[PDB]
Design a protein around this ligand. Sequence first.
Ligand SMILES: NC(=O)C1=CN([C@@H]2O[C@H](COP(=O)(O)OP(=O)(O)OC[C@H]3O[C@@H](n4cnc5c(N)ncnc54)[C@H](O)[C@@H]3O)[C@@H](O)[C@H]2O)C=CC1
Ligand SMILES: Cc1cc2nc3c(=O)[nH]c(=O)nc-3n(C[C@H](O)[C@H](O)[C@H](O)COP(=O)(O)O)c2cc1C
Ligand code: SF4
Ligand code: SF4
Ligand code: SF4
Ligand code: SF4
Ligand code: FES
Ligand code: FES
Ligand SMILES: [Mg+2]
Lengths: 59, 230, 217, 43, 433
Amino acid sequence: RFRGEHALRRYPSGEERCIACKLCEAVCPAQAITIEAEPRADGSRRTTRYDIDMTKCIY
Amino acid sequence: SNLIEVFVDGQSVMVEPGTTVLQACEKVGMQIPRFCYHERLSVAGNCRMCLVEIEKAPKVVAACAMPVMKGWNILTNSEKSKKAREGVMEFLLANHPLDCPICDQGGECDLQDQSMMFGSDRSRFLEGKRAVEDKNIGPLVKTIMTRCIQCTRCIRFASEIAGVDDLGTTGRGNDMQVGTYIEKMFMSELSGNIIDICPVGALTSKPYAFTARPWETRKTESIDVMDAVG
Amino acid sequence: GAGGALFVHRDTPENNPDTPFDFTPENYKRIEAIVKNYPEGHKAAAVLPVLDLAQRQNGWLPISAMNKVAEILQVPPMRVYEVATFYTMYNRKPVGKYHIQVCTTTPCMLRNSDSILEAIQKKLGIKVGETTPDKLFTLIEVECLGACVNAPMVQINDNYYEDLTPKDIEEIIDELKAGKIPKPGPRSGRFSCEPAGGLTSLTEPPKGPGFGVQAGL
Amino acid sequence: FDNSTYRNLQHHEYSTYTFLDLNVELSKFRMPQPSSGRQSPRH
Amino acid sequence: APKKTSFGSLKDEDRIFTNLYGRHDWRLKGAQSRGDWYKTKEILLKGPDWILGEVKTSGLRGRGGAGFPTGLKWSFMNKPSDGRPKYLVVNADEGEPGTCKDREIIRHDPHKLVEGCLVGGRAMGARAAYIYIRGEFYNEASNLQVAIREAYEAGLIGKNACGSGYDFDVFVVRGAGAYICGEETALIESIEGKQGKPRLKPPFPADVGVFGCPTTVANVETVAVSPTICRRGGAWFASFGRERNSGTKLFNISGHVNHPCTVEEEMSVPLKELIEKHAGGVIGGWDNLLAVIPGGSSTPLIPKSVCETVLMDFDALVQAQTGLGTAAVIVMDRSTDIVKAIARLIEFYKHESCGQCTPCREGVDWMNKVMARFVKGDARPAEIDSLWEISKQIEGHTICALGDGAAWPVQGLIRHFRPELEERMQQFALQHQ
Ligand SMILES: NC(=O)C1=CN([C@@H]2O[C@H](COP(=O)(O)OP(=O)(O)OC[C@H]3O[C@@H](n4cnc5c(N)ncnc54)[C@H](O)[C@@H]3O)[C@@H](O)[C@H]2O)C=CC1
Ligand SMILES: Cc1cc2nc3c(=O)[nH]c(=O)nc-3n(C[C@H](O)[C@H](O)[C@H](O)COP(=O)(O)O)c2cc1C
Ligand code: SF4
Ligand code: SF4
Ligand code: SF4
Ligand code: SF4
Ligand code: FES
Ligand code: FES
Ligand SMILES: [Mg+2]
């Protein structure tokens, strides 16, 4: 359960798990997450910007 | 004058004849939950979310359609009203897809908010869900009809406000689908408004898709200059 | 079971707006008689009969027929689409010459409608939603045709064949495929909904007019 | 008088157009229809 | 001795539908030889108030299944006109499983229905009658049209109907395969060329009905006994049956009986007497009886121990936690899979729902899935109570009574056959380990 450096994960096919719902951005107590999204070339819901300020983050 | 006296939770209200139970309730600042009712559309009475108990009346009434009678005491927060709301919300959510993270409606969804305010907090539906195919109605209004709750708001708007009779329902029962029955574009100068009246993410803005969430937006009240209507 | 049919139309060479449909002049006179049965300013009330008439002329309802009805009655085509997809008696796909409809609801099921259905399936070699390769028969299951006393029963082209056994329905199908007209009604030797035991009621000769009339009338 | 015979046999010779032919025949017997004052609710 | 305590053994002279079995000529001449169209002019000249009084005194309740007092319901149209035409709609949809009574009235006694249309329309001050018949009854509708043509040619209806100076038209409109279109407001919507979706009430049809006009929707059996009621008087009809349960009734006995049949009988006849007298008894004896649905698929079933002394009227069957309904008695013997039959009824309701309102559209399909699992025993016993609650959520929260008609049979099955459901679940859990 140890909380360390952040990472973004994938499905076993290599597709990104993130679908740009922005719940992490909304809940973040430090406002450390910045997300921008648009439909991808194939129409998928994916992020164009996913930034975490690790000097703002409280882990 | 010609007003009649009714009661909302025992509080006296004078209303004109033809006032519905919902309007009488909102005279005292109480908003009855709704899905199908819209004050600028004709009354439908199909969603059943507005059911409310009248004192000494065995059966609950649809507040959006029922004219209020003299001497009626509307019980907006009784056990009967709350249980009716919970049952209707359960029925609405039984087949609804688990789309909130990928649905553009999330955060400004009347289904979500009225589930949080008037529904229960868990599920007891143990079956599989229905899934319907999508209808292409143009480059402006994105359609994902598995989220449709069959409110009939878009149909009534298209018929009454826009004067276009291209929307309707096909089939019946659980298989009833809202659409055009043919591959047809709902291209009207007022078409985009069906995005706003649709309570759920069934109809969304295609240019706006996936770009923002409602809570992060700042609202600037302004005036349109695209015509002289203002 | 879940309906395998779809409620969205996709254009096909066999079924598209350019598919030729038009009412015959006799059917146009019939449409005129139908429309005159409703008050002026309420023509749309004729949607259900006129649409049905198109089926009785065409066998089924291509989308061109729906458009023709909508044009004739000055009704938006989507309203006609709603009517055509709501009511189950309308055929939006072609069916066989003899549409066989077997009631499987509980009163008929208690009288072994399953045996009738399996007998039909074996005699025709198809299933409960299919059409024969010769386009002569289509078989489906329906709900309570309203003759539960005469169960089990089958409807074929608005004719009722009741009090059925597997041999009875096989004989009916044999007579149908030979071009004959099988007589509708029960097959048990009983004319109607009467008790088979010997007419437990209405045995006395019916009384005349004014037999029980009250005074002052 | 007798109860032995079934007397409802005319429906054995009804065709696809019997009902509508009877309607066409009945058309001449009806009273003039009422009018709402307009051609349709969209007029 | 007044105040009859035993009911049944109805005589042929007192029976109303004398050509129930079609053993006599159904044409105009045969109907006139049987008492139809006799002194109709004097009945119409008595005035609407006299006719409504006869119906009120008669104690007739709605034979469509709900049993609303017919005189009171028809009195709603005794108001002065407001510039709109007035209409009588006769309900011949007959969609309820186990009910085939209307069909026999239409095919074998059409002139009774036509004269009833005339008399009821005069009482309600209605210009014309629209008879709505289900589209599967093609031959019945053709016979009705032939009878209407005969009445038109003889001057019995139309202009100057029966010489009474009152103009009345009779129209036949055919439905297209929809059980919901027997609901009166759904029937009205179907006539106007729309989907058969029921309207909310108020307004009631007497205020806003077909074409937006004052309208009364009345069941065919209710309509077809009114001319006989007027002729013989309200009191004669009143004597039969218990108090507030007056008159005669058409019963359709189907299922596991030796001679399934349609019969006419006094109102408050005991169910056992009816089954053993007219239907030949239960298949395999009376002790073989498992359950009976007394009033069509919408009424809850009752087990054998209740069927032995229950009477076939509105109030007695209400006391027996069921309803008189359409008086369609479906008999199931001890060889019946009681869960499977009710599951089939629930599937019927799932396929007949119009889909307009959320509780029916979603919950009836949900209950159908749960019952399909209950047949196999796949579920857990707790779900039984869950199912009960689902029915309560659906009941009373829907625009029309199809939701009530889907919730009630499940409630009856749970009330009387819970051990069967639990026992099936035990077997499923045992065999699947
Ligand atoms: N004959 C058949 O084939 C079928 C019969 N049914 C029966 O229909 C019954 C339920 O039907 P509903 O119409 O929903 O019952 P209901 O009680 O709501 O209405 C019965 C009749 O009385 C009238 N009425 C009732 N309350 C009134 C009021 N306050 N003011 C003015 N008029 C009023 C209604 O307009 C209606 O015509 C069921 O019990 C069922 O047995 C159901 C399906 C088929
Ligand atoms: C789902 C549903 C189906 C119905 N079907 C019929 C029908 O086929 N025939 C009928 O007479 N009444 C039917 N009824 C009852 C009618 O709505 C109405 O109560 C009745 O026709 C009134 O006539 P009465 O007062 O003469 O009984 C149905 C009701 C419901 C809710
Ligand atoms: S936006 Fe955040 S919460 Fe939503 S899927 Fe992506 S990482 Fe998860
Ligand atoms: S419509 Fe509302 S409840 Fe449904 S998926 Fe979208 S956000 Fe969630
Ligand atoms: S798309 Fe929206 S407005 Fe239209 S029926 Fe569905 S939920 Fe109602
Ligand atoms: S209860 Fe069922 S049939 Fe009746 S209006 Fe609602 S969805 Fe339609
Ligand atoms: S808001 Fe009244 S039924 Fe939907
Ligand atoms: S159950 Fe078969 S006709 Fe009704
Ligand atoms: Mg929306």
